[PDB]
């Protein structure tokens, strides 16, 4: 099998943002990292002026700016998830603009397990070295000096194995690190000096101190203060060589502070964001001395307002703050001196679209022209919403829900979408549960609730704890034209909605919304009860038609030739819709794995679990039971699966990879007829949550599968012929010899299948983005690529422009 993978919408989720002087010394820049993309802007007081946007062959993990002594502008350091390090420089040749790789080199080790807190990348203030913390027990040091083009580094043994955060201190004669670590005694702050000549750790400027057992971040305060600030769940403490000051502000106890940014270059003010969108400012009050020295007088924290759930923050000129958000739209906010008539000092100025995370989606034709439009379940918590993507090229419309959407399906006969959603409520003294804010499930025109005395759990005393978050699930009906929340049906207490399907069954004319749920209780590890509720949308309200009680979680459901096929724990059960509007068990097939994923094409069904266990089944009419055709048990975390054709199955497995399994051609054998050979391997660099058959356009390529990712990237996979794959595979090796990669990262090393303890070259996949880049190069370069292998530059223009038409 041979496939062509191309990006339709680039990743929108922001994972990093920094400010500095990268393009010139006289311009203030704003650099934004969006997984594999880097955007460069110039702050001018009227907003952000786009200047340069590039793509890298790697998942940007670290991104920091620094200015060595001899440099006129700032240099940019980037480390990737595959440990590709590079020092970059912005170069403008009048009209042409180019990112230059001053230094580069892979910094991974042959041994060592990735650290628990992930990659930490810090640069010394006086640009003497780059410190990296990749594995537990080691601290990699890349010495910063002129002729170090290969980014050669050395490792220093670190005794403290469970380091949470680390930073380089300011105003120190020798490079000094300050970090928090956890040992069986608790958490502690410690300092260490780094001597490049010695290649070892010397004693730090101040002795080890104890911190809050929940201390999570370290902020090195620039001069005149020096020292460091340790932030935990309930305390903010300062520490330097001769002083310490601690505060326990009750205004921070509701949520954990997880991101910070410095406002004043001297460290007088610092913005702080939590997991729920609250934005705070920390003031380092100063008591100046007669000799110009400054001591820390007191610490004060004040809540400013509400922003989108912030991943990273960056102060820009005059009250303007950029809010990078992984879970919602990124923003440009204004920090007003006087509060508005609501009480917030923060006011939104601009909103930047963020599809990420895409949990589910579907393709639908609404204006009824022939062009399919994608409707995704995006965001989470207050950022949760629906996004309609149409074919600047892609037009996006947002429908805010203020709660987490989970599943989506389109009902043609009702002109409305069905969306499973969840809202967080908290127990109150009254004895019930109260919601944090109004949302789609609480603002519907009409609402309904489930009832079930017959579904009383035995081991559940229902003595729910006080002040505990409770997740309430609902099924929302949303109009396809106005997108208003028409109806909201709440499920039973402790009931978790998992699967959703809209279909007709048997001889019944009525299309129904069917939901597969699970009864989740804290005491029970695995659900022992579940429900398959059938719903009919009539008179702008949802009415239950049939309710079937099952002994397990209904992880997935699908329409199978007029019947309902559901997956309850390990069993794959088929049901028939009788003339009395009831579900009746037709047959059961017990599997040896958890039936999480369930797809069907024709008479065969694909079953999968979270550990990439793929088993094929076929419903035999004579037997009245299912039969295993083939199986592959290659243990690895699988996030999504899809049937490409009768003998090809596309999936997404751990370390942001795509794979295709093929059914053997039955070459006078039986043990290989039940074996699925892996023919496709590719490192996408995105975490796929959903595959979807369909297209957004009005046949050299066979088939069309769209997919949504955590970073909001939308991609497309299509099959190719034998002759078409070899020509495009030849053109990739040719384009890689000419195209200049930012950081000088080889395309073969970026797309090769990679896991923590395994790496193999990519097979059966064509990087469509690389092929489409051929058109975006100068005419003399276009001919350089097609030199020999007959095939002129002009001939390969309509070939690539034909592949462009697919998306």
């Amino acid at each position: 099998s041979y496939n062509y993978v191309v990006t339709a919408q680039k990743p929108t989720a922001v994972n990093g943002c920094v400010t500095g002087h990268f393009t010139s010394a006289e311009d203030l820049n704003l650099l934004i990292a969006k997984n594999t993309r880097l955007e460069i802007y110039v702050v001018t007081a009227e907003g952000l002026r786009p200047v340069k946007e590039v793509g890298m062959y790697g998942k940007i993990a670290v991104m920091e700016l620094f200015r060595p002594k001899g440099e006129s502008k700032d240099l940019l350091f980037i480390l990737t998830a595959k440990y590709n390090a590079c020092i970059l420089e912005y170069k403008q040749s009048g009209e042409s603009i180019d990112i230059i790789t001053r230094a580069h080199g892979n910094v991974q080790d042959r041994i060592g397990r990735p650290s628990e807190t992930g990659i930490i990348g810090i640069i010394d203030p006086e640009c003497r070295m780059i410190g990296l913390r990749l594995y537990d027990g080691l601290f990699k040091v890349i010495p910063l000096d002129r002729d170090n083009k290969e980014l050669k580094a050395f490792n220093i043994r670190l005794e403290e194995l469970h380091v949470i955060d680390v930073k380089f201190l300011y105003g120190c004669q020798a490079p000094t690190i300050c970090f928090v670590y956890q040992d069986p005694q608790g958490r502690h702050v410690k300092t260490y000096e780094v001597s490049l000549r010695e290649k070892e750790f010397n004693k730090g400027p101040w002795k080890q101190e104890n911190v809050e057992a929940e201390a999570s971040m370290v902020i090195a305060v620039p001069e005149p203060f020096g020292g460091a600030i340790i932030i935990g769940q309930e305390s903010i403490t300062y520490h330097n060589g001769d002083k310490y000051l601690a505060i326990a502000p009750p205004i921070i106890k509701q949520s954990t502070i997880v991101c910070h940014n410095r406002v004043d270059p001297n460290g007088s003010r610092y913005l702080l964001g939590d997991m729920e969108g609250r934005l705070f400012m920390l003031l380092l009050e100063k008591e100046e001395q007669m000799d110009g020295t400054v001591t820390l007088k007191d610490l004060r924290v004040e809540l400013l307002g509400e922003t989108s759930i912030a991943e990273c923050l960056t102060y820009l000129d005059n009250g303007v703050v950029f809010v990078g958000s992984r879970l919602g739209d990124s923003q440009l906010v204004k920090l007003n001196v006087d509060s508005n008539e609501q009480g917030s000092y923060v006011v939104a100025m601009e909103t930047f679209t963020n599809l990420g995370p895409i949990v589910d989606m579907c393709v639908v034709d609404l204006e009824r022209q022939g062009q399919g439009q994608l409707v995704t379940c995006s965001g989470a918590f207050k950022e949760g919403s629906l996004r309609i993507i149409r074919n600047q090229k892609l037009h996006i419309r947002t429908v805010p829900l203020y709660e987490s959407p989970r599943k989506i399906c389109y009902q043609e006969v009702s002109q409305c979408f069905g969306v499973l959603s969840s809202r967080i409520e908290v127990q109150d003294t009254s004895g019930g549960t109260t919601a944090l804010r109004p949302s789609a499930s609480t603002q519907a025109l009409s609402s309904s609730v489930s009832s079930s005395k017959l579904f009383s759990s035995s081991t559940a005393p229902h003595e729910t704890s006080f002040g505990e978050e409770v997740e309430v699930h609902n099924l929302l009906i949303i109009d396809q034209h106005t997108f208003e929340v028409l109806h909201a049906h709440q499920f039973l207490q402790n009931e978790y909605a998992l699967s959703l399907v809209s279909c007709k069954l048997g001889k019944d004319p009525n299309t129904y919304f069917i939901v597969g749920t699970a009864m989740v209780y804290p005491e029970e590890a695995e659900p022992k009860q579940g429900r398959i509720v059938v719903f009919q949308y009539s008179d702008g309200k949802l009415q239950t038609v049939a309710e079937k009680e099952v002994k397990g979680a209904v992880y997935s459901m699908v329409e199978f030739n007029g019947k309902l096929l559901a997956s309850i724990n390990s069993t794959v059960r088929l049901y028939e819709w009788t003339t009395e509007k009831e579900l009746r068990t037709e047959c059961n097939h017990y599997n040896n794995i958890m039936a999480l994923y369930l797809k069907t094409k024709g008479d065969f069904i694909l079953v999968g679990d979270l550990m990439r266990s793929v088993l094929l089944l076929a419903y035999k009419p004579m037997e009245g039971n299912f039969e295993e055709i083939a199986r592959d048990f290659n243990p690895n975390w699988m996030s999504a699966v899809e049937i490409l054709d009768d003998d090809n199955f596309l999936g997404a497995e751990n370390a942001f990879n795509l794979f295709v399994c093929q059914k053997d051609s039955a070459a006078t054998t039986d043990e290989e007829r039940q074996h699925l050979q892996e023919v496709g391997l590719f490192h996408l660099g995105e975490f796929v949550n959903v595959f979807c058959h369909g297209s957004l356009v009005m046949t050299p390529t066979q088939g069309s599968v769209l997919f949504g990712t955590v970073n909001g990237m939308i991609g497309l996979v299509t099959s190719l012929s034998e002759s078409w794959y070899n020509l495009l595979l030849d053109m990739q090796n040719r384009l890689n010899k000419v195209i200049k990669s930012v950081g000088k990262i080889e395309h073969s090393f970026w797309r090769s299948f990679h896991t923590e303890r395994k790496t193999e070259p990519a097979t059966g996949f064509i990087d469509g983005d690389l092929i489409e880049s051929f058109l975006d190069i100068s005419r003399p370069k276009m001919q350089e690529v097609v030199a020999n292998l007959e095939a002129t530059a002009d001939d390969l223009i309509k070939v690539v422009e034909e592949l462009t038409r697919i998306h």
């Binding site: 608790g186 997880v258 991943e311 949990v359 590890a525 040896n592 958890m594 266990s613 303890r757």
Partner: protein
Amino acid sequence: TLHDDDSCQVIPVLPQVMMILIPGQTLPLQLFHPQEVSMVRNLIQKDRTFAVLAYSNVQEREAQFGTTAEIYAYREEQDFGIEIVKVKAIGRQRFKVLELRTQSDGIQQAKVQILPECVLPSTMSAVQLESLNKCQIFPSSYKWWQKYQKRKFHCANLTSWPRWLYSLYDAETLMDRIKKQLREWDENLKDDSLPSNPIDFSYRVAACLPIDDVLRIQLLKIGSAIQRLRCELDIMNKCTSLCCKQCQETEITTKNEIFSLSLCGPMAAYVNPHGYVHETLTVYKACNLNLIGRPSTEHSWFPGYAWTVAQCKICASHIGWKFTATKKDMSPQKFWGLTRSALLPTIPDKVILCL
């Protein structure tokens, strides 16, 4: 000695061993022939590792699988002039058999491919937000597990699955659930006695479950420790009826009757006078068992108790023994002891086993 995986390595084979050994199971050996002394002494000064062979069809010498066993102890008795090598070994890595050659001295050397131990990372490592990386270190029981799940699997909101599903594939949660189930059978179980590593814990549990040889083979075929833990936990919840192996359908006892009389657990290995080893499972009550002969205290594995042979009421196959107390003050006055090799784990009223 832990050789590289997915590579074909030649390992010496011990001729007098034809029994399936689970990684990390005590196998005391007592060799005597000089053909099994000059090789056991050659390995002691090189790598200290011999190969135990598993035969699917013991009657036709069909060997397609096996597991290595590192030599960790050496003692040589000079009794009556005849050299006796007394060595104890422990199982390390599973291997597959491809081709076994025969030498001209009396040893077989086979090129075996070591099947990898698939160590997967955490399910949240590829989806954890960088801002929340610093919230993964928990500071240092029913409500503690609720907060453990709520914090470790918080990022499940970015995927298509909930937090409770990810707990079903979490090594720490699975091992804790198995420990609770094992505690029901052994009130005298010590936590320090069980390994903390998911690889060693899974193999230790596989050698403690009262299951037939076919199921022991199935668990060893599994490559990941997560799937092996899940299958072991599924056996404990579903295979509640223990039946006679020969009859396949005659029930003998139930899971709820399993208990531990001594401090070696509910199914310890004991050796009879003739030297045969019996992994004996102790239960309070049994059905379809007839008693043969009279009680005897000779060679009793449990002090203060007399044994009486027990057999299948339908097929007359040996199942184990009944233990009657000699003193009227012993609390478990009467209990049963069943040899593992005589029983068939069965799922009562057909569901199968999940990985």
